[PDB]
Amino acid sequence: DTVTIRTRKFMTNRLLQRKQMVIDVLHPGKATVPKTEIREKLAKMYKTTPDVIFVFGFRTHFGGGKTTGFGMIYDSLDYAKKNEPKHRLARHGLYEKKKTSRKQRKERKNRMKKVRGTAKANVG
Amino acid sequence: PVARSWVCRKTYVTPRRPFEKSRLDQELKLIGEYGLRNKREVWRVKFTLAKIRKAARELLTLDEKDPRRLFEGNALLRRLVRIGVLDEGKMKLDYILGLKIEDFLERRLQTQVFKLGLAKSIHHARVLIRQRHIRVRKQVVNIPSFIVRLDSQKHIDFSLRSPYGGGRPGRVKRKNAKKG
Amino acid sequence: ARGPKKHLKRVAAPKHWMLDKLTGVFAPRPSTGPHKLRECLPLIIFLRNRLKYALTGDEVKKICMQRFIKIDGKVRTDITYPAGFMDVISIDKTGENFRLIYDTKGRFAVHRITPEEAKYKLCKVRKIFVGTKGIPHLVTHDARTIRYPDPLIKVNDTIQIDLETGKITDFIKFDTGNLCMVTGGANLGRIGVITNRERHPGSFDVVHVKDANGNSFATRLSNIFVIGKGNKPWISLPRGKGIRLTIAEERDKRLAAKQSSG
RNA sequence: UACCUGGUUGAUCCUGCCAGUAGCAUAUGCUUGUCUCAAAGAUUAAGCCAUGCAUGUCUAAGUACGCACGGCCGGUACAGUGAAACUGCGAAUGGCUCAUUAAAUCAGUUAUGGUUCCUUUGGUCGCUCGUACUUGGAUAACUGUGGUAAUUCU
RNA sequence: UGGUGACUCUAGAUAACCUCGGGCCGAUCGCACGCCGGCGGCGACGACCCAUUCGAACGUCUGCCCUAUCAACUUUCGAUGGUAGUCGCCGUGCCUACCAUGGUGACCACGGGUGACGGGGAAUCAGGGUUCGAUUCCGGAGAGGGAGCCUGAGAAACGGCUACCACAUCCAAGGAAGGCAGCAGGCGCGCAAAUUACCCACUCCCGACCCGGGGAGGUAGUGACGAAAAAUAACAAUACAGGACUCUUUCGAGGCCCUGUAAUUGGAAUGAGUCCACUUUAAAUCCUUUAACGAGGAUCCAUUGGAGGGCAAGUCUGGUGCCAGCAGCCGCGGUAAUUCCAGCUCCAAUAGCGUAUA
RNA sequence: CUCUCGGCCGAAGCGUUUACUUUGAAAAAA
Ligand SMILES: [Mg+2]
Ligand SMILES: [Mg+2]
Ligand SMILES: [Mg+2]
Ligand SMILES: [Mg+2]
Ligand SMILES: [Mg+2]
Ligand SMILES: [Mg+2]
Ligand SMILES: [Mg+2]
Ligand SMILES: [Mg+2]
Ligand SMILES: [Mg+2]
Ligand SMILES: [Mg+2]
Ligand SMILES: [Mg+2]
Ligand SMILES: [Mg+2]
Ligand SMILES: [Mg+2]
Ligand SMILES: [Mg+2]
Ligand SMILES: [Mg+2]
Ligand SMILES: [Mg+2]
Ligand SMILES: [Mg+2]
Ligand SMILES: [Mg+2]
Ligand SMILES: [Mg+2]
Ligand SMILES: [Mg+2]
Ligand SMILES: [Mg+2]
Ligand SMILES: [Mg+2]
Ligand SMILES: [Mg+2]
Ligand SMILES: [Mg+2]
Ligand SMILES: [Mg+2]
Ligand SMILES: [Mg+2]
Ligand SMILES: [Mg+2]
Ligand SMILES: [Mg+2]
Ligand SMILES: [Mg+2]
Ligand SMILES: [Mg+2]
Ligand SMILES: [Mg+2]
Ligand SMILES: [Mg+2]
Ligand SMILES: [Mg+2]
Ligand SMILES: [Mg+2]
Ligand SMILES: [Mg+2]
Ligand SMILES: [Mg+2]
Ligand SMILES: [Mg+2]
Ligand SMILES: [Mg+2]
Ligand SMILES: [Mg+2]
Ligand SMILES: [Mg+2]
Ligand SMILES: [Mg+2]
Ligand SMILES: [Mg+2]
Ligand SMILES: [Mg+2]
Ligand SMILES: [Mg+2]
Ligand SMILES: [Mg+2]
């Protein structure tokens, strides 16, 4: 019941299709608010669904009163899917990486650097 | 190459003659009265003041009418005022050279807490600050040597998180209450 | 080094870009283009730093590929494409139109403009050469080269160019009693009226300029840029009227702004 | 902070160095709870080097007849994703080190009216009076037959 | 016609020239589909040549450490200048041909040395200096040593190639392949220096490209090079022990200040740690946020040097007896050692402190 | 210090030349 959302710098990008802003949080007793919570409070301010909003970079000040971050709120889910850097989509679980390491595709790369045409595909 | 800042300074200088009765006694007194940790803390202050005295001395050779003397001087005096050392009567340039160590050892948070009578001994104070019971405005300060600005002095508190002003009891009262 | 250099170290970037030591080893290295790199702005500095629109290089990239940004009415999809003094950035989506002028302090500032005024720019004429069947040629500071100009246009004259047709509408001749900005130098970003121009053969030509506050200073002729006829500038001026300030008075500017704030 | 003490003589004043005293970097001995920063195979051997990686690249817009996929509707020249290969571009930057190098490098200063310049930006691109509703041959991937202990061989 | 401080400039007119180891004039691609059998909108590549940008390359003026146990130097083989060329991208003894006999030097040439890459800078400093700058920015050089070229706008390129020298790998003995002064890591050298870690999220770069790639870079690990903040206790009572102000002729009294020591009591306060969850982040880590536990004696204990003088601090106590030993220097040690070896004490700086060396 | 043009003042001159001095502009960022 005691948690407070204020929004400091605020701007609208017509060109990224988003409401892009700074998020302030008052949480005097508690440990830092989890993001899945803060999205809800934030959501009910701008009346939009939870889905479409992305908060990050939360930092808590010494002595435990306040927390500062960024958030950005997209018009359509889809716009988000295009415009958002992917890892953030992945914290929501929309986008999924490939689990191959760097040594992996590096090795495979130098392997098929050694053969001619159709044979390249036969290597892994 | 890298993305890193290399800048740093030394915050103090160690005296030329290591052992002299005079220095040792005077600096011991300074240590005791304000409850400092080691001779370093004294040299630290002594050095920060020393810089100021150098700036001033190298303004004083310049003519009054010079833009730089006027501007740079007014800045220096202003900082020196708002920390609480100088007054606005004495706000001329030369009264700077009239400054002593004690004056900065005044405006340390450690001593301010003991002057405002929040803590009952100087050392009790140094503990109290480090123990996070102390706060400035809404801000909690963990450092004994935090120079307290003139205007920020009027609010120095017991920090609503703590037992003292903020009504939750500590570990110790908790245990004695769980036995009884 | 064998051949040309493609990187720019962050620290050696041009000062007035205002970059930080902390966030990288490099900086943008403006692509080759119309304005000299030392002098100019890259689109990515301007768009993500001055304007704050984009946070990172990548968000910017996503901006230029929706082909939003137009420089002089044409889409530039290159993010490091240099814009420079006296240049127009049009963003159609926000209806925002920026011209690039120098501050008093010598930095490019964000300066907003009427959609009307955005339809033209000023240029300096760097040289005049005749070529190919006696046809006269203009070269601006923008590198725009223009043929069949009015024979009355001589060197160091300003032209007004329609950005649509790329054709000169009318021009201002370089003379005492006209109104200029210093483009690069110590005095960069200042505005005044030409008092005097002294000529040293075999060297730089020295120009004296006087303010609206009556202060005077010199530059090299190449650094002068003639904005207006008599006392009245053709372009909109930036918020700072283009007159510098002794530090001392600027401090009091700030202070009065602190006492009137509340 | 514009600073000096001990040491020659039985004692004294000197010249005078030795020693002390404070920083600063490299090493090193002992010790070490907390947090923020952060240098780090330069000196001697620009001595030697296993192994892995450090430079690749496709839009709608240069070449697709790989069924590799699917793909629909199937005489549609070519629907579409697309490995490979040809083509284009890049590999001259960046990274490392300090052997050489003493008006050389280099710094400020100037010049190119004494030259070259991928690219980018703008200019030009029916100014020439004399099979085109489209031209010629080859080659790679691919198919196959191979060689050599050995290769990013052919 | 136009332009410069100045052209053998730019533009114009005339005669011709034009390389088969050829110069320009688009035999090309996409998306929309529309108009009166014809017409065309936007783009993508191309392209000779101007101009421009990034440059690059040669020149100008002034500036460098030590050395005379280097005083004359260069010129038959270009030294200095002249004239015509060749070569080059052009200016030039750059190179050839022919002439001239010059050019440099105590204002230090020429030669040698440098534990010499040059700067921006660093350390130290009253004023003046001295020393250092391999090292993150700028410039130069180099990729085992030399040399020589292909390709190209651009290399005399080394994660291209061709030799020779030095090294070293494979071999079926015919042959083949090498270049860590990129990142890691290994050997050797040494007084002397980190993980065969995770990443393209940031910063920028390259590409036909919004999409791919990057040991450039970023992030962790190791890190007492160095720099910043900063714990190891605070409080109260007593118990005294003491001391200063007040009262008393003194005895004494004081509820008034302080201080120590308390194998005195007392609960209050916290971080170190352990540790749920959040946050952090490309994924983690740390910090910060926060629940839960977590402080009374050898514990959750501070060490390094010192204790004759310089120089701060012992005429202690026991051992040694010109030995072992200390001692930077002056000195100490030969049976009462304020200097050794130790126990006690105290003294200096303090999460630091000693040694050696520039 | 002085004359030829332009709107009594600017461009044109020179005065022997330097050193010294003050002033301007140029001096990458870190
Ligand atoms: Mg390089
Ligand atoms: Mg000139
Ligand atoms: Mg004697
Ligand atoms: Mg004696
Ligand atoms: Mg000495
Ligand atoms: Mg902690
Ligand atoms: Mg080495
Ligand atoms: Mg060396
Ligand atoms: Mg290829
Ligand atoms: Mg290109
Ligand atoms: Mg073009
Ligand atoms: Mg085959
Ligand atoms: Mg000649
Ligand atoms: Mg010649
Ligand atoms: Mg000859
Ligand atoms: Mg050397
Ligand atoms: Mg040096
Ligand atoms: Mg260096
Ligand atoms: Mg290194
Ligand atoms: Mg370098
Ligand atoms: Mg090289
Ligand atoms: Mg080697
Ligand atoms: Mg090329
Ligand atoms: Mg080579
Ligand atoms: Mg290599
Ligand atoms: Mg290379
Ligand atoms: Mg290595
Ligand atoms: Mg060893
Ligand atoms: Mg080390
Ligand atoms: Mg990246
Ligand atoms: Mg990518
Ligand atoms: Mg690296
Ligand atoms: Mg670590
Ligand atoms: Mg150490
Ligand atoms: Mg430290
Ligand atoms: Mg920790
Ligand atoms: Mg305890
Ligand atoms: Mg001890
Ligand atoms: Mg002893
Ligand atoms: Mg002593
Ligand atoms: Mg003593
Ligand atoms: Mg010693
Ligand atoms: Mg001694
Ligand atoms: Mg010492
Ligand atoms: Mg500077």
Q: Nearest-CA neighbor of B76 among B57, B100, B102, B103?
A: B57
Task: Measure the CA–CA gap between C184 and C222, rounded to whole angstroms.
Answer: 9
Query: SS3 helix, strand, coil % of chain A, rounded to 5?
Result: 35, 30, 35
Q: Is residue B4 part of a domain?
A: no
Dihedral, CA atoms, B110, B115, B116, B120, nearest 10 degrees?
A: 80
* Residue C212 and residue C232 in contact, taking contact as beta carbons nearer than 8 Å: no
CATH of the domain at A118: 3.30.70.3370
Contact A13 C62 (CB under 8 A): no
Domain that holds residue A107: 1-124
DSSP letter for C195, please: E
Task: Measure the CA–CA gap between C212 and C226, rounded to whole angstroms.
Answer: 16
Interacting residues of A114 by C-beta distance below 8 A, sequence separation 6+: none
How many CB atoms within 10 Å of residue C68? Answer: 19
Cα angle value C147/C150/C156 (rounded, 5°): 90
* Residue C54 and residue C46 in contact, taking contact as beta carbons nearer than 8 Å: no
Q: Note every long-range contact of C214-219, with CB atoms under 8 Å and residues 24 or more positions apart, other chains counting.
A: C215/C243, C215/C244, C216/C192, C217/C186, C217/C187, C217/C190, C217/C192, C219/C182, C219/C185, C219/C186, C219/C187
Residue B163, SS3 per DSSP: helix
Number of domains in chain A: 1
* Residue C227 and residue C122 in contact, taking contact as beta carbons nearer than 8 Å: yes
Q: How far is the CA of A121 from the centre of ligand 12 (A)?
A: 15
DSSP letter for C40, please: -
Domain that holds residue B42: 18-180
C174-244: what CATH class? mainly beta
Q: Nearest-CA neighbor of C101 among C244, C246, C253, C239?
A: C239
Residue A9, SS3 per DSSP: strand
Task: Measure the CA–CA gap between C96 and C114, rounded to whole angstroms.
Answer: 9
Instruction: Tell me the nearest-neighbour CA distance from A11 into chain C, angstroms.
Output: 8
Give the Å distances, CA to CA, from C112 to A64, B140, C41, C77, C87. Answer: 42, 43, 16, 22, 12
How many CB atoms within 10 Å of residue B10? Answer: 8
Residue with the two structure tokens 């960069």: C188
Task: Measure the CA–CA gap between C158 and C102, rounded to whole angstroms.
Answer: 17
* Residue A72 and residue A15 in contact, taking contact as beta carbons nearer than 8 Å: no
Number of domains in chain B: 1
CB-neighbour burial class of residue C108 (10 A; exposed 0-12, middle 13-18, buried 19+): buried
Task: Measure the CA–CA gap between A108 and A106, rounded to whole angstroms.
Answer: 5
Q: Where are the beta strands (DSSP E) in C116-250?
A: 120-131, 135-140, 145-147, 158-162, 168-172, 179-182, 191-198, 206-210, 216-220, 224-229, 232-233
Task: Measure the CA–CA gap between C142 and C74, rounded to whole angstroms.
Answer: 15
* Residue A32 and residue A24 in contact, taking contact as beta carbons nearer than 8 Å: no
Q: Nearest-CA neighbor of C182 among C99, C89, C84, C103?
A: C103
Dihedral, CA atoms, C122, C126, C127, C133, nearest 10 degrees?
A: -40
Q: Is residue B155 part of a domain?
A: yes
Instruction: Encode burial over C34-58: b for 16+ CB neighbours within 10 A, e otherwise.
Output: bbebebbbbbbbbbbbbbebbeeee
Q: Nearest-CA neighbor of A68 among A27, A101, A14?
A: A27
Task: Measure the CA–CA gap between B164 and B128, rounded to whole angstroms.
Answer: 11
Domain ranges of chain C: 1-116, 121-171, 174-244
Task: Measure the CA–CA gap between B115 and B105, rounded to whole angstroms.
Answer: 12
Q: How was this model experimentally determined?
A: cryo-EM
Q: Note every long-range contact of C70-77, with CB atoms under 8 Å and residues 24 or more positions apart, other chains counting.
A: C71/C43, C72/C121, C72/C163, C73/C163, C73/C164, C76/C43
Q: Is residue B46 part of a domain?
A: yes
Q: How far is residue B69 CA from its own chain's centroid?
A: 27
- Tokens, residue B43: 């040299």
Q: How far is the CA of C214 from the centre of ligand 29 (A)?
A: 63
CATH topology classification for C1-116: 3.10.290
Residue C258 touches chain B, beta carbons under 8 Å? no
Q: Which chains touch B (3 or more CB pairs under 8 A)?
A: A, C
- Tokens, residue B151: 């205007």
Cα angle value C52/C53/C54 (rounded, 5°): 95
Domain C121-171: what homologous superfamily? Ribosomal protein S4, central domain (2.40.50.740)
Cβ of B89 near strand E (distance < 7 A) = no
Cβ of C135 near strand F (distance < 7 A) = no
Cβ of C181 near strand F (distance < 7 A) = no
* Residue B44 and residue B12 in contact, taking contact as beta carbons nearer than 8 Å: yes
> Closest residue to E2 by CA to C1' distance?
C130
Task: Measure the CA–CA gap between C81 and A43, rounded to whole angstroms.
Answer: 38
Q: Is residue B151 part of a domain?
A: yes
